[PDB]
């Protein structure tokens, strides 16, 4: 096999293995601010940022036809000063090499329209604080598959849990095809999970970079942070 | 840290790291069947099995107050020649190191009655089939929380697939004390999780073993089987990497 | 694969996955003393204990005719208060699942005469400290594997380092058949290594119990301890 | 902890996720090709060749004032056309993050002279086929650590096995600060070892990238491949269970 893993049980102010674009940057405290927050712990609107692992995974084969199977784990909040107007969510993304953040707002840093393109090569799960009809959101906060398009292959509702701590995890499976995503709050002891068939031979490179990308909104007020506290992947591609 | 690891991707006719109790067997094509299957792979009533793997696993120390986190995951079918008619399921377990089974169909081997009782020492996750409604079973096949009782802390809804191979996640987090279950059919894409806070180290010894338990129904007609096909499992007892650990196997 | 595998990073008075044999005993502050010592930390003579783990490990398969890789670390002490006149040492090994302690003295609790049997089916890494010419051992303490006879097929010098303690990793690589045993004072910044083919497929059975055994001399004043601090464990069997 | 990980068990000819320098190539058969071998198989001379594992990797941590353990393991073949006439050698090492081939031959990519200079902050272990007298080479062909020069601080023996494959195993203890590393030939059914002390937080910076570097020798006819089939790497900066980074890892 091939194989690449990492753990940030925290991150440093200095991390030269992760690719921070846009607004993302790491506090003294050790956490990913994602998008903008100001010295009091306020988000910022018109906010857009991404974190990316420094190193390029391999996520299938040209001469065997395999693909990798691979696991990722991380810890985020939410924070939202008024959990009635808010926006746009964050996602964890496997995209090409060279990738540069996209469009912000509703589109997560991820696809340029509402429209389905192959040449995004993107997979990724979302985690979608705003309903943008635009896309056929569904009427709630949900956790999405997106292949190639903002408007999510299949969703389910997650009910966001105000400046509390998410544990997310998210598995795909080689041999079943099964892309699956999960996510609790330990402190409420709510739990979500989604699964659905994603062939990413079909819809991604060989190569890829991994990592992070989360939108706040374009009105005023249609705010909230997209804190990372912990992050760990693996990835296996057998020979 | 203490840690107790395994994985069977199979089973074997032959498996001395595995303790076999009531009608328990592995199959030659490899296959646990908890529970009586005839060899047409017609499951029989009035059954009772076990299985738990032959060391004891350290959950938590006195001396130092810690507990473990663990994960484990499995994967098993559960089939029945009439669904109208199915009973009574199958639990993963932790238990004292000498448990034994207890009463069967809707007991699933691992208590007596419906009242709670701390001498069980036992926590399990089931995947019930069968409405006990003097067990305060809900109006559907769900997976169920049991500390030290069949009237489970917690439940949520499992539609049960018939026939269909189910991966299963179980983890246990000891920092914070979360214990979370998940299901999922890659036939079907349908997934189902549960999430509750249980506090091992008032509900357990301890030492521990952990495996499965399963019961068919105590009346003719209401069968099904419940055929483990591959388990792993890793404890982590510090003085679990799970994203590898998945992976891994 | 059929894998199995465990840390004890220190031993406990209560330890019932470990099973032990003869004199062996695990102390309150968690250092598991294979031969007996008394009360001033005095090692004592005509002393035999051995400790396996308590799960049979699968190693081969008749089926697929497949063999196990393995690897084991562990950190151990030989204290003797006279190193003018120590006795017999210590081995990790691999034996059948009913095993139970053969002679003791330079029989290390694993064989009964100095003949070879293929009815041992019992592979073990010895760090011997005495000199038995009947067991062609060589002229100076050493590290050695036998296999269903106390004889070594292999040797290498290992001068003991008193007092201080041992690291050793062993590892057996299925594909090569090579098993390699390393050792090293952390102390004295020495280190020695061994490396053999041994085909375990036609040794030992299918399934076996894995762990320690030591002993002190059968003459006064013959002794040294065989402390162990902590140990691991992994195999894997592939289909 | 924060912990990084590969595993290459064989290279490809498009591989991102390391940095070729200097002559390194890996060719269709997926052998890293560090110093230059013409088609026939034959290593030229005057060839210095690096590759690194793409990542910054954290060594140390001034704020907690921890260094990592890591492990590392590789398999490598060493041919000669002439095992009489043998240069430069090659080396597992770890450089500062921007580091870049320093002078070629003895000096194997990672040094510019025989004085030692805190400013490399360079730790390597070499496997060295050619004696510099002027480095304090002893002389047999040997295994050496390197800190911050070319004059190793310990060396053992190393009996070359013409043209056939190599295992090390590269490891360091935060706790005992001791670097061993072994190398076995499973063909000959030989062995080597070496440990030293080395205080990495007083050598390297908290950050390397991490990886190896061959020369061949300055003459016509001092001439070896310095060939890499597989390598894994594993760090773990506690704020690696080695048995299981053997095994698997
Ligand atoms: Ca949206
Ligand atoms: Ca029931
Ligand atoms: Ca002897
Ligand atoms: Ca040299
Ligand atoms: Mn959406
Ligand atoms: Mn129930
Ligand atoms: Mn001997
Ligand atoms: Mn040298």
């Known amino acids: 096999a091939e194989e690449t893993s990492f753990v940030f049980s925290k991150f440093k102010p200095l991390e030269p293995n992760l ?19 100001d010295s009091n712990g306020v988000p910022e609107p ?21 693909v990798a199977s691979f696991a990722t784990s991380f810890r985020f909040t939410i924070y939202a000063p008024n959990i009635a107007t808010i ?11 060279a990738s540069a953040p996209d469009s912000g707002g ?8 509402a429209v389905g393109d192959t040449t995004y090569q993107t997979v990724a799960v979302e985690f979608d604080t705003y309903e943008n009809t635009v896309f056929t959101d569904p009427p709630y906060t949900h956790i999405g598959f997106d292949v190639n398009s903002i408007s999510s292959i299949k969703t389910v509702k997650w009910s966001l849990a105000n400046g509390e701590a998410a544990k ?5 499976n080689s041999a079943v095809k099964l892309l699956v995503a999960s996510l609790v709050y330990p402190s409420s002891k709510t739990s979500f999970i989604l699964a659905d068939i ?16 989360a939108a706040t909104g374009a009105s005023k007020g249609y705010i909230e ?15």
């Open 87 to 97: 926006a746009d969510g964050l996602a964890f993304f496997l995209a090409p090499v």
């Open 198 to 213: 994603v062939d990413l031979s079909s819809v991604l490179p060989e190569w890829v970079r991994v990592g992070f990308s």
């Open 168 to 172: 997310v995890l998210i598995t795909y």
């Open 225 to 239: 942070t997209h804190d990372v506290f912990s992050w760990s992947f693996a990835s296996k591609l057998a020979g």
């Open 19 to 37: 690719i921070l674009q846009g607004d993302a940057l790491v506090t003294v405290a050790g956490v990913l601010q994602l998008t903008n927050v």
């Open 46 to 66: 018109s906010s857009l940022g991404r974190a990316t692992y420094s190193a390029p995974i391999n996520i299938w084969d040209s001469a065997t036809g395999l």
């Open 106 to 113: 509703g589109f997560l840093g991820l696809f340029d329209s």
